[PDB]
Curated annotation (Swiss-Prot), chains A, B, C:
The chain crosses the membrane at residues 5-25, 39-59, 70-90, 110-130. GO terms for biological process: mucociliary clearance; pigmentation; Wnt signaling pathway, planar cell polarity pathway. This is Vang-like protein 1. It is a multi-pass membrane protein. Changing R68Q: In NTD; uncertain significance. Belongs to the Vang family.
Length: 376, 376, 376
């Protein structure tokens, strides 16, 4: 490809510095003997170390598209470019033009290249995933719609990288965005639109419709939940492990005995747009295959669940928008607020400094853990 | 031991390369002078760095037994073996057989050994705990019995190492496996065994025994909980901090005033097989010692709690079984499912790829945060 | 400053070893030519790598004051001190006093210094944030007042560093210490003070005041919650996005229509000492600015929330006290208990070993996932 070709070039630069003096002036080399080969072996082993490490932490596809440029990867690529181009400049101007003797020195130059390129690899790991290991900041991430709030420690990251960690943890941790669960508030607001301290006072003196409606809805949800549990238990008890059929046909055989209760529960919890019949049968054959209980099958459907339980078209990984007052390549600090906007909701994230903590020993003597039967 | 002896050998290989030319041919060395000693000091300091780092990240007992071989540790041991054996081969064939001059070069060979062995240490850290720092995959871990589900980001790990991280997080995070809490479903299923769309329809039209039984059981659990809270509060108020007695005798003195309520609560929550009287007295003296409140004592007993709250024979760390369709030394990828089976339950873990995320700036002007008093 | 001056000294030590032979004996140098410059370039690039890495992971303010000395940072500073002082000792005794020839060797000495100082940087990262990456221990952290309990995996850390990670996670994860929520128990205990197995038996036979009082308080809290939700929904619907006013004046305009319900809810949940009117208006203008819903505004006020949601004087980062039976510089092990005492509560933390886990393959054939329609 493109980056792999440049990786091959930067990997073959030491070998190119080594092989050319024997090719271009074979008779002109001074006899190295033992030191040159004892150096070649260290060169080869360090290049193998470099290849294994570069495979381990850089032979991978890009993780995300970021709004501005990645500062640290651009810094590393510029460093590698000036590094390799300067070494070629010195090897062409001061080695190839002069057709130098004492080839052992050329071998030290190549091994210095290998050492410094290993330290470039080490600096790359330092900049990319070792700089944010120490949890310097805390990020409160709140959805703008239902207000689900979670905190996360991060290190010294830019707003871009912190936002991407926030999104990783969003798809992991936050429950999936359900706009249906948001409709009631909207209608209530609109109903107040259909119809300042004293006016609020009269609202308190009025009938709290919301309390009793929420209690009745909770009662209905628990009723549908118990119906669903009984239905799924009977439906799993209708098949024995041991006509012989695969778990797909077993799921299709036992599904009509749970389908109506599950439909009613997903409509009473407004989750019917998140579980297609095909997906329910897929997860059902999954649970039948892996020997799970009715409750283990059903816990996907009881609670809302995070975004990664659901289908791939359900999460819109492509349309996230980072809204920051400052440049998003700037690092995190205390008090900054950035907002990760999706199509209908937004992750309002405010960053606070984890405070400076002072500890001090006080010595509690195990002789001081005496106790008496008297009252206190 | 065995591995420590090989560690001593790999640590003394440079010192063995250094000390032998003065021993085996003392008069034949060319005078080094300043450079050789200025090299010895760098050698010694780098070997001290190597010793400190190897102690810091490798002087520790094995963490877990894995089904197949650890790929990366075997790769590192093979690398060290070929590394050291090749250096001995070169030192024996091309240095000892020829009884070489210019001892400074022998010192560079030894320092190249030290440098490359430091980079082997660095590659070992790269392969072992720096390769999975970047959270590449997400793992949904569901118990097969009660369906408790948690997500975890992992990096590029094999199925073995990912499964072991899943087990670490299982003993940390998931509530402890309580088969008693599973009995009711079983009996209900068996009761349906004692006695297809229309037949389910008639189930919906029937009396939902489960809803009212769950509500009544919840009521009973809350009643027992309040009894237990009052009991433990009175029992802690029966002793003053200040006959003088240790917290063990204080726990034994105040336990009979909480014992019956705690027994009834642990039987109504089916937790009586997880708290022995000796363990309750131990935790009670622990709470009396550390000045905890009745609620701080009681929160261990109110909720189910994870597996590591309990006794050591309670968690069966030895009998875990990794069930994967492919080889467990293969790395994680999107869509693979592996199952960690214990004696009665199983952690069904499916691995998904954290999706490719695209961010883009949109600029919200603080001039655009204007607002009016009119309704919307 | 002080540490920056020593950093400048340790950064200029190689440059000081290089520049002095041309200054102090200019005519006495043997001609180096190509090797010396091809070495200088590697020196400069490795020093640039060192500068970037030292900026990335050490140019930062101190994170916390610890009771005893930090063992690893003191070890690293002692290592750097003996390192640099020994190199100056060799450069003064064996190089400057003798006014040596073969300047290439001086350049190798300086580059060995740069290499070993890069490995000191690497050892510093190994000791500081790579030693605890592997989750060796689990820490149960329980507050002594309300008993909120969370587990955390840590690596090989000292009691000091583990306690500071526990405090980072305390301000992140645990709900904020509310002594008002603790008053009821105290009064109940005192009431029992105002007035042993049979006496507890009679307590069970008595009226459970706590159950019905908790149920009635829960009912009141839900009532106030629904009042508050309706109030905040109407108050947000009173302003349109589009007299033109900033979100501060919008918050002040819509606040009197939610103020009484919010005051009643914060008094019924005993959160009135944690939200000042100024803070409520600040968060209100924050929610109006970022386009959040009434529920997104209100979720800060509904639940208790962790400590970092609140004001900076609310968390007393300065007065934490580490109580350990052993030395706090000792590393974690199985069974140790340390207590982090604040002004009124204490984080009782007990450390357990994550158990030794044995895995083994068992092969479940996809041919063995057959199923039949018969009952089980």
């Amino acid at each position: 490809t493109v980056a792999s070709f440049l990786g091959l070039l930067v990997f073959l630069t030491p070998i190119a510095f080594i092989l050319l003096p024997p090719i271009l002036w074979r008779d002109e080399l001074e006899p190295c003997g033992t030191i040159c080969e004892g150096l070649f072996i260290s060169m080869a082993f360090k290049l193998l170390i470099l290849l294994i490490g570069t495979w381990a932490l850089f032979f991978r596809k890009r993780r995300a598209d970021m709004p501005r440029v990645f500062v640290f990867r651009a810094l590393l690529l510029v460093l590698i470019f000036l590094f390799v181009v300067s070494y070629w400049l010195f090897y062409g101007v001061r080695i190839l033009d002069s057709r130098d003797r004492n080839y052992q020195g050329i071998v030290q130059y190549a091994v210095s290249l290998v050492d410094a390129l290993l330290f470039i690899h080490y600096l790359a790991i330092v900049l990319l995933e070792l700089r944010q290991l120490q949890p310097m900041f805390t990020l409160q991430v709140v959805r703008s719609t239902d207000g689900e709030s979670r905190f996360y420690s991060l290190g010294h990251l830019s707003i871009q990288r912190a936002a991407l960690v926030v999104l990783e943890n969003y798809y992991k941790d936050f429950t999936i965005y359900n706009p249906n669960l948001l409709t009631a508030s909207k209608f209530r607001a609109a109903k107040h639109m259909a119809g300042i301290a004293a006016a609020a006072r009269r609202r308190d003196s009025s009938h709290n419709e919301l309390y009793y409606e929420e209690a009745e809805h909770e009662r209905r949800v628990k009723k549908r939940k118990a119906r669903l549990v009984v239905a799924v238990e009977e439906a799993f008890i209708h098949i024995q492990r041991l006509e012989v059929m695969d778990p797909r046909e077993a799921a299709q055989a036992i599904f009509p005995s749970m389908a109506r209760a599950l439909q009613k529960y997903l409509r009473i919890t407004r989750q019917q747009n998140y579980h297609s019949m095909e997906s329910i049968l897929q997860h059902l054959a999954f649970c039948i295959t892996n020997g799970m209980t009715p409750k283990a099958f059903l816990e996907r459907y009881l609670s809302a669940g995070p975004t990664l339980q659901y289908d791939k078209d359900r999460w819109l990984s492509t349309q996230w928008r980072l809204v920051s007052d400052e440049a998003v390549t700037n690092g995190l600090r205390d008090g900054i607020v950035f907002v990760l906007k999706c199509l209908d909701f937004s992750l309002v994230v405010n960053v606070k400094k984890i405070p400076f903590i002072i500890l001090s020993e006080e010595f509690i003597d195990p002789k001081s853990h005496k106790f008496v039967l008297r009252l206190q």
